[PDB]
C-alpha cells in the first residue's frame, strides 16, 4: 500500500513545516528594526554636548544625564520645526515624553550607633519597599512628589538591575523643544535626582508619519547605592494596524490556514491516544506530537490575546496632548518577542519532528564535498570562457557602443545578455562583421554547451546519491 500510512503523514508534516516557515517569515519587521536602530544611534551614541564627553553608554556622574539632555539629545530629538519633532525632517516622534525617578525615601537606611557622630544615613537599591513616597526637596507640585504605582500606571518589572516599581516622582514634557529644554534645565538646577535616588527612566513614542510604524522608546538608568549609574535604552515596536492591503490579507489567510491545520492535526491525533495506548511519553514519537500541538495552540492563543484591543494607538492619535501609559504595551511587545523566539524554537522542534527518516544526516557529506569540487572545477572553465569573450567584446566594440566602453561594464553587459536583456542595435551597427559573429557564437556556447554541463553535473550527483542510498540502506 504505502498510500495512506506512508504518503499522508509525511506530506502533512512537510505542509505543516512549510506553513510554520511562512508564518515565521511573515514576522520579521525590517522598517521597525531600522527605525529603532536609527533612534538608538541618535540617542545611545549621542554625547552630552559638542565639548563634553558624557554619552548615554558612558554614564559616570550625576551630571552626565543633565548635560546630555541639553545638547545632542536636543539636536537628534528636539529638532525645530519648519517646534515639531523631526531631526532629518523624516523621523516624526509621537506624542511627548515623560520622566520618572524612583528614589530612595528620606532615611532609607540607618547609620551605626558606634559611629553616629559622623555617619548620617545611607540609601538602599531600588525596590518596591525602597521607593520614595513623601516629598524630596522643594516640591511645588509633582516635580518632587512621588506618584503612587497604581495611580501612575506603573508596576514592577524586575529587569537587569532591580524591580523598579511604578512609585517615584513623575513629570511630563512639553510640546516645544525650547520648552522641553527649559524644563530640563529647571529640573537639573533643582534637586530632582539627588544623592538619595536609586533609578531613573524616560519614555517617549515615535511615529515617523511617513511610515506606518508607531513604536515606544524607553531609556533607563540604574543608580547603584555604591555611587554612579548605568544607563541603557530599549525600543518596543508594538503596532496593531496590520490590516492594510493585500499583504495583510495574505498574512491573515496564512494565519487562518495554520490555525485550521493545527485544529485538524489535534483532531486526528486526539483519538489514537485516548481509545488506544495511553501514557506514552518516552517514545520520542507520541509525546512530541502532543507537545507540538499544545505549544502551537498556546502560542496562537497568546498571539491572539496580545492584539485583543487596538484602541490604545487610536486614542493616542486622536488626543496627543500627554504621554500615554505605553509601558504596559511595551511589556506586551517584549512578551510577544519572547513568544516569537519560542516560536522559532518550536519551528526547530517541528523540523526535528520532520526527521522521522533518520540516519541520513552525516553519511552523505563525502558526496556533497565531491559535488562542490566538481562545481568549483566547472566555475574555472566558465569564467575563463566568459573573460575571453568579454576581452574580445571590449577590444572590438570598445570605442563605439557606450555599452562595451569600460571593462568593468562589459561583464555586466554580458550578464544582462545571459539573463535576456540583449540590445543588438549598436552591436550590428558598430560592426556588420564580428558583431553578429560574436553574438551568435556567444549564445551558442553559453546556452547550448556550457549551461547544459552545469545541469549534467548535478544530475550525476543526484543519481549517485540515489544509488548509494538505495544500495547501503536497502542492503543491510
Amino acid at each position: 500500500k504505502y498510500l495512506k500510512s506512508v504518503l499522508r503523514e509525511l506530506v502533512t508534516y512537510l505542509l505543516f513545516l512549510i506553513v510554520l516557515c511562512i508564518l515565521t517569515y511573515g514576522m520579521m519587521s525590517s522598517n521597525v528594526y531600522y527605525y529603532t536602530r536609527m533612534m538608538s544611534q541618535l540617542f545611545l551614541d549621542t554625547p552630552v554636548s559638542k565639548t563634553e564627553k558624557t554619552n548615554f553608554k558612558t554614564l559616570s556622574s550625576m551630571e552626565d544625564f543633565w548635560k546630555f539632555t541639553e545638547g545632542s539629545l536636543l539636536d537628534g530629538l528636539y529638532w525645530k520645526m519648519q517646534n515639531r519633532s523631526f531631526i532629518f525632517y523624516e523621523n516624526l516622534l509621537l506624542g511627548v515624553p515623560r520622566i520618572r525617578q524612583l528614589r530612595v525615601r528620606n532615611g532609607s537606611c540607618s547609620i551605626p550607633q558606634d559611629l553616629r557622630d559622623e555617619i548620617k544615613e545611607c540609601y538602599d537599591v531600588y525596590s518596591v519597599s525602597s521607593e520614595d513616597r513623601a516629598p524630596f526637596g522643594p516640591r511645588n507640585g509633582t516635580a518632587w512628589i512621588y506618584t503612587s504605582e497604581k495611580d501612575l500606571n506603573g508596576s514592577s518589572h524586575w529587569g537587569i538591575i532591580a524591580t523598579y516599581s511604578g512609585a517615584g516622582y513623575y513629570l511630563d514634557l512639553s510640546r516645544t523643544r525650547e520648552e522641553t529644554a527649559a524644563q530640563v534645565a529647571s529640573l537639573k538646577k533643582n534637586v530632582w535626582l539627588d544623592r538619595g535616588t536609586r533609578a531613573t527612566f524616560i519614555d517617549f513614542s515615535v511615529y515617523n508619519a511617513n511610515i506606518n510604524l508607531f513604536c515606544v522608546v524607553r531609556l533607563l538608568v540604574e543608580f547603584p547605592a555604591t555611587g554612579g549609574v548605568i544607563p541603557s535604552w530599549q525600543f518596543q515596536p508594538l503596532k496593531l494596524i496590520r490590516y492594510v492591503t493585500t499583504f495583510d490579507f495574505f498574512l491573515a489567510a496564512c494565519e487562518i490556514i495554520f490555525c485550521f491545520f493545527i485544529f485538524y492535526y489535534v483532531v486526528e491525533e486526539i483519538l489514537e491516544i485516548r481509545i488506544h495506548k495511553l501514557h506514552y511519553f518516552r517514545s520520542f514519537w507520541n509525546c512530541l506530537d502532543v507537545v507540538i500541538v499544545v505549544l502551537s495552540v498556546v502560542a496562537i492563543g497568546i498571539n491572539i490575546y496580545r492584539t485583543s484591543n487596538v484602541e490604545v494607538l487610536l486614542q493616542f492619535l486622536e488626543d496627543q496632548n500627554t504621554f500615554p501609559n505605553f509601558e504596559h504595551l511595551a511589556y506586551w511587545q517584549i512578551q510577544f518577542n519572547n513568544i516569537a523566539a519560542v516560536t522559532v524554537f518550536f519551528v526547530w522542534i517541528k523540523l526535528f519532528k520532520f526527521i522521522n527518516f533518520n540516519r541520513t544526516m552525516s553519511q552523505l557529506s563525502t558526496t556533497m564535498s565531491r559535488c562542490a569540487k566538481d562545481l568549483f572545477g566547472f566555475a574555472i572553465m566558465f569564467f575563463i570562457i566568459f573573460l575571453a569573450y568579454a576581452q574580445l567584446a571590449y577590444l572590438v566594440f570598445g570605442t563605439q557602443v557606450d555599452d562595451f566602453s569600460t571593462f568593468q561594464e562589459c561583464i555586466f553587459t554580458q550578464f544582462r545578455i545571459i539573463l535576456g536583456d540583449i540590445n543588438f542595435a549598436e552591436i550590428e551597427e558598430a560592426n556588420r562583421v564580428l558583431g553578429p559573429i560574436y553574438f551568435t557564437t556567444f549564445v551558442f556556447f553559453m546556452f547550448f554547451i556550457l549551461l547544459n554541463m552545469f545541469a549534467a553535473i548535478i544530475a550525476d550527483t543526484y543519481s549517485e546519491v540515489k544509488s548509494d542510498l538505495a544500495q547501503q540502506k536497502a542492503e543491510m
Binding site: 519648519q82 525632517y89 508619519a209 511617513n210 511610515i211 506606518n212 486622536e318
Partner: protein, 49 residues
Amino acid sequence: LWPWMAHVLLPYVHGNQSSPELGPPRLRQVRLQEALYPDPPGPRVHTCS
C-alpha cells in the same frame, strides 16, 4: 477635478444625441471628520497614512 468635470464630463453626459445615458450621475462624498494635516511637498509620501 472641477475643470475636469466642467470640460469633458458635461459634454459627454449631455449633448444632442451623444451616447445615451439611462440615469443621471451622482457625487456621494465621505468626510472622515478628522481633518488632515499635510506634509511638505516633493516626492509622494510613501503610499498613504
